[PDB]
Amino acid sequence: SARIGEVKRETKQTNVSVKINLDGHGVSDSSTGIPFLDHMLDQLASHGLFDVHVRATGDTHIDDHHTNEDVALAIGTALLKALGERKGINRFGDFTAPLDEALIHVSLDLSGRPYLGYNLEIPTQRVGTYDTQLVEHFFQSLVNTSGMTLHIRQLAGKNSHHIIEATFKAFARALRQATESDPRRGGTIPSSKGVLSRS
Amino acid sequence: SARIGEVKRETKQTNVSVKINLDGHGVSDSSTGIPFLDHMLDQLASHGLFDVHVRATGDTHIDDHHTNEDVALAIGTALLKALGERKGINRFGDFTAPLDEALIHVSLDLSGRPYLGYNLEIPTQRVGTYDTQLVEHFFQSLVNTSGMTLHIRQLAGKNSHHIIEATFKAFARALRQATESDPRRGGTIPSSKGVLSRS
Amino acid sequence: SARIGEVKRETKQTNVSVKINLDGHGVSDSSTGIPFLDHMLDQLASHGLFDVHVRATGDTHIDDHHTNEDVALAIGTALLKALGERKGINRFGDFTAPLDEALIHVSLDLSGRPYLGYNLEIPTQRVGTYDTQLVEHFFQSLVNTSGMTLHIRQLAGKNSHHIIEATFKAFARALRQATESDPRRGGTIPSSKGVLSRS
Amino acid sequence: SARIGEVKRETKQTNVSVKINLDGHGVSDSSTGIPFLDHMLDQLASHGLFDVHVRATGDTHIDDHHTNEDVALAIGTALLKALGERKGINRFGDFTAPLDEALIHVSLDLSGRPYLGYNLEIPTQRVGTYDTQLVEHFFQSLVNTSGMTLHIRQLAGKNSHHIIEATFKAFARALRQATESDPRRGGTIPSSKGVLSRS
Amino acid sequence: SARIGEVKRETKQTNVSVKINLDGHGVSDSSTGIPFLDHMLDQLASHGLFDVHVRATGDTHIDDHHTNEDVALAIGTALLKALGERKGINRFGDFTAPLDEALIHVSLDLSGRPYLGYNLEIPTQRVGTYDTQLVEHFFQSLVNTSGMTLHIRQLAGKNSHHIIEATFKAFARALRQATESDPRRGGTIPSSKGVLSRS
Amino acid sequence: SARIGEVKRETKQTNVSVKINLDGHGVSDSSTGIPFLDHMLDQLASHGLFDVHVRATGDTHIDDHHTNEDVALAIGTALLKALGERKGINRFGDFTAPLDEALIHVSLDLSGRPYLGYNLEIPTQRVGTYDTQLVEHFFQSLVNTSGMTLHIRQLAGKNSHHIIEATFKAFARALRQATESDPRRGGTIPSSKGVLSRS
Ligand SMILES: O=P(O)(O)OC[C@@H](O)[C@@H](O)c1cnc[nH]1
Ligand SMILES: O=P(O)(O)OC[C@@H](O)[C@@H](O)c1cnc[nH]1
Ligand SMILES: O=P(O)(O)OC[C@@H](O)[C@@H](O)c1cnc[nH]1
Ligand SMILES: O=P(O)(O)OC[C@@H](O)[C@@H](O)c1cnc[nH]1
Ligand SMILES: O=P(O)(O)OC[C@@H](O)[C@@H](O)c1cnc[nH]1
Ligand SMILES: O=P(O)(O)OC[C@@H](O)[C@@H](O)c1cnc[nH]1
Ligand SMILES: [Mn+2]
Ligand SMILES: [Mn+2]
Ligand SMILES: [Mn+2]
Ligand SMILES: [Mn+2]
Ligand SMILES: [Mn+2]
Ligand SMILES: [Mn+2]
Ligand SMILES: [Mn+2]
Ligand SMILES: [Mn+2]
Ligand SMILES: [Mn+2]
Ligand SMILES: [Mn+2]
Numbered sequence A, B, C, D, E, F: 001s002a003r004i005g006e007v008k009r010e011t012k013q014t015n016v017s018v019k020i021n022l023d024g025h026g027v028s029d030s031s032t033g034i035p036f037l038d039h040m041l042d043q044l045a046s047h048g049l050f051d052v053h054v055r056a057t058g059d060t061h062i063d064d065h066h067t068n069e070d071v072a073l074a075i076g077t078a079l080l081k082a083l084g085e086r087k088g089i090n091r092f093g094d095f096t097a098p099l100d101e102a103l104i105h106v107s108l109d110l111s112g113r114p115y116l117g118y119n120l121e122i123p124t125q126r127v128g129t130y131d132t133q134l135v136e137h138f139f140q141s142l143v144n145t146s147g148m149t150l151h152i153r154q155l156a157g158k159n160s161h162h163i164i165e166a167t168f169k170a171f172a173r174a175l176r177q178a179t180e181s182d183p184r185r186g187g188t189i190p191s192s193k194g195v196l197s198r199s
């Protein structure tokens, strides 16, 4: 009864397949056509202990944007599917993680209501070939399909790779917390209104 | 083949029923337990030509918040249902409407991607018994379930009732435009990527 | 059943005759004794498709003010007469028009309630022999007798003739929109309160 | 030959009846459904010596706005009717009145041309249950149907009830002055252009 | 051996009864005469897993202040009673929780020394009928009788209901953490000075 | 009698072929050697309903500039050819379109007089391999050969791809409007001076 979400999503621009196990062992298996994003998805598996399987192709000759967005949308849907009615879970996650001089605080609530608060200030435009504007878009798209309340707050940082990587580490650990079983909940839905829904 | 969306939504806090006809004749039939919101929903019908049927009850002794939110969520879902695959529609709407000294520009895209840009500055806290913070929440919740890109821009205004009412008038007219048939489209999906989706 | 409004207005200072057809073909026939105003009224006909007949004489040796005002008052009354109960009309108009570097946004509502919002900053005092303060007065007087809510917003412009002319072009197109038949209205009055009135 | 104006005005939102005698003895008889407004209308009678009869009902569960506006519109029309051709009157009124620390200067001209200049800064949002934004709207609507040039200038004041009440006292006295017979006029129209008109 | 604290507290102004189980299952049973406060106390149970029983009556016709204060004082005493010598507990709690755009960080230490650090900026005066100044007073009074060091820090937020609710969610989770058994402590008092005391 | 403009333009630096149908069905067929520009030209077809055929080659090893410019010049000439004497057309177009957080207002007049007003602030230097300075140059060159008055105004936006794409969407819709038949014009030239000319 591991919670597994699977999504296939295709448009004229991109083709995406995602399989995520919330109760994983950190199996990392991401190939998006965007090497830096693959590296970040590896962090999600390694530090979140999610099993993360992603395959994507797309119109990277135009730019990485459509692929990045469509991967994020599909991951969000996969998370939503895996989570189901959200019975017995912690629901909330909260973690601050460094990478050297960078320090990122991530707080999230698996509420069913999409919201992104994001204040990263990434001081360079490209990390490798990866457009650093795409980080915000990745998280925005992911929250929109997952129905997640997500806050990402930059507390320190100078190196762009460090800032983004620390964000994924903190996110992975916050998401792990939120998705894990609350040992006291007794399988009840963790909401005073009796339901958690993306509608 | 009128496009009609119907939603019933209930929680421990509220009970909501919505029926909206996109191809209506402005039939107004809204009773939310929040008189000012009913007045605004009347504008949606009158100026958008939507048929709007809303019934809600809820925990207004705590405050109008949960009712307001839950009505908005249900309306957004009703719009999504009515819109279907979004074939043959204008998709985009754009209108600036006054009410006396107030002037509000609303621009929207039935994109499938939720976003609210909102800059109203409503100078009083209560219009009648209605908490003016709830206007932003109404639109935010509506975009989240409808999969709408929505921008609301205050160009002028001093009277709070005028500001909010002008917003609903402009929104109604922009939404009417966006939902109406594009006479040249020939029933094609109005997107270069071949699909419009909330996922 | 073309909607035609006719006004004769005389005082000790001026003598004015106006005939306007809302359902016209752009017949331009304006002679006010103020050549620049005649040029602007020509734009109203050409871009609004109104048939515009104006004759005025007055005390232009004192200045153009009284004539300009009295022409505007009479035009506003003519519009009010032509509009009648305002059944079946769009009611609202909204257009932004350029003339070269100038760009003017006009938004109006045939509400029955006079209001002018005006922010033009015309950088010279005379266009030909025409006092550029008289532009604001023209629109103010027109809204007062027509029962129009009118907003005029200068978005760009440097040449005074361009600024004023772009204003008349945008106004003409917004007014055309507002006066035209709403194809869905089914002849109903476009107001939730059941009536549109200058009282 | 007392100058009496009577108006009945009804919409889907409100029902209003007004009778005003310009040559009254201060008979106060106002019941609008808005107690604070009734108190202000009492000042109009007491200090203006108008006989003021007002009855209104309306949608106060939405808010007091529509009632307040519609009462003001009807009062303005009643004044216009009572004034007729404005022969033999002072036409202009000018008065500054205090209420304790508050001091309000009101200047008006029964010109036929609506204009409101208003600079009150009322430091609280509610006086009793009365929304203090509605004061400006009351005067704006009244000038629009009466064809009055009206300037209201706050010279001092801290208490909101005092500020608004002093405004009505000053207005009542300015309006009394303007409506009263000029003992030298000899029944002539007090305008160099030979007529005073709302058109 | 569930840790249960019970308090009955009465004055000439209020009557309060509280029963709290630190080792609860989130049983919510709060009726204070202040609906918004009841909603917040529901969050304490739902997210803290405390069993919370509160009954209060009082002089709400004067305002909600005395009731709010006296409920808070009684809850604090109930917590103190339930906690006893504080053997074997985590003692410290730390959590940041969102509600949509709002994000509140709560840190607390069950030290025996009362202190409130509070920086919320709640942008409206009333949530429903609840005076938003009373939030600070609730926490101040609670810390004073419980002997708690409590810091409440607003990281983001615009909607007053969201800000206050997120505060209670974060507080509930921090308090749950602090009151729970430390699995390594071996029942020792978690203080280098050998005792934790409100004196 | 579809309005079709065809241009072949060659220099030592570039070779360009353009065919545009103003009365198209959104046939997209653009290959410029600049993938991002191709994506933008696809928007022109999809949202403008133009049939757009572009082939270009050029000195992209130097940079994309000459190709971008020469494509724009050729498109402008193609539009001019297709438009002819501009009889019976709307002439003016005005639209504000979003893409998520980006919001761009485009206003244009097919006047015969070239002018570009442009205020985009695109926060990154490269979208994919496309130099973001080239957007302004594309529109400037296009207006110069088409004889178009064009204003592009950035109202909101953070993502460079979104800002540029929203610009093309708004432009396409404004241009569609301007080129479409005015149903009332009766085939007259929409100018008070009797002619529209690039000279
Ligand atoms: O839905 P939640 O479990 O976060 O909490 C219940 C209710 O408070 C919540 O729906 C709410 C949303 N906005 C204000 N409150
Ligand atoms: O999906 P749209 O039809 O708004 O346009 C296609 C594609 O450009 C779009 O998916 C996109 C999203 N972000 C950048 N582009
Ligand atoms: O009269 P309108 O049709 O613009 O809308 C009805 C009512 O809302 C309107 O009379 C009003 C005026 N001020 C606030 N509302
Ligand atoms: O109409 P009055 O009586 O205020 O004054 C005559 C004339 O000067 C007046 O109509 C005018 C209006 N604007 C400038 N002057
Ligand atoms: O009492 P605590 O366990 O927080 O720590 C012992 C001692 O350091 C503490 O009493 C103290 C108080 N002020 C400074 N130190
Ligand atoms: O040429 P148009 O149709 O925009 O309008 C006629 C005339 O006003 C115009 O040529 C002009 C140019 N500059 C000022 N006016
Ligand atoms: Mn995107
Ligand atoms: Mn790394
Ligand atoms: Mn909410
Ligand atoms: Mn209203
Ligand atoms: Mn004048
Ligand atoms: Mn000209
Ligand atoms: Mn009003
Ligand atoms: Mn008093
Ligand atoms: Mn106290
Ligand atoms: Mn709540």
Ligand SMILES: [Mn+2]
Pocket (backbone or CB within 6 Å): F065, F069, F137
């Ligand atoms: Mn160049």
Ligand SMILES: [Mn+2]
Pocket (backbone or CB within 6 Å): A066, F039, F161, F165
């Ligand atoms: Mn794109």
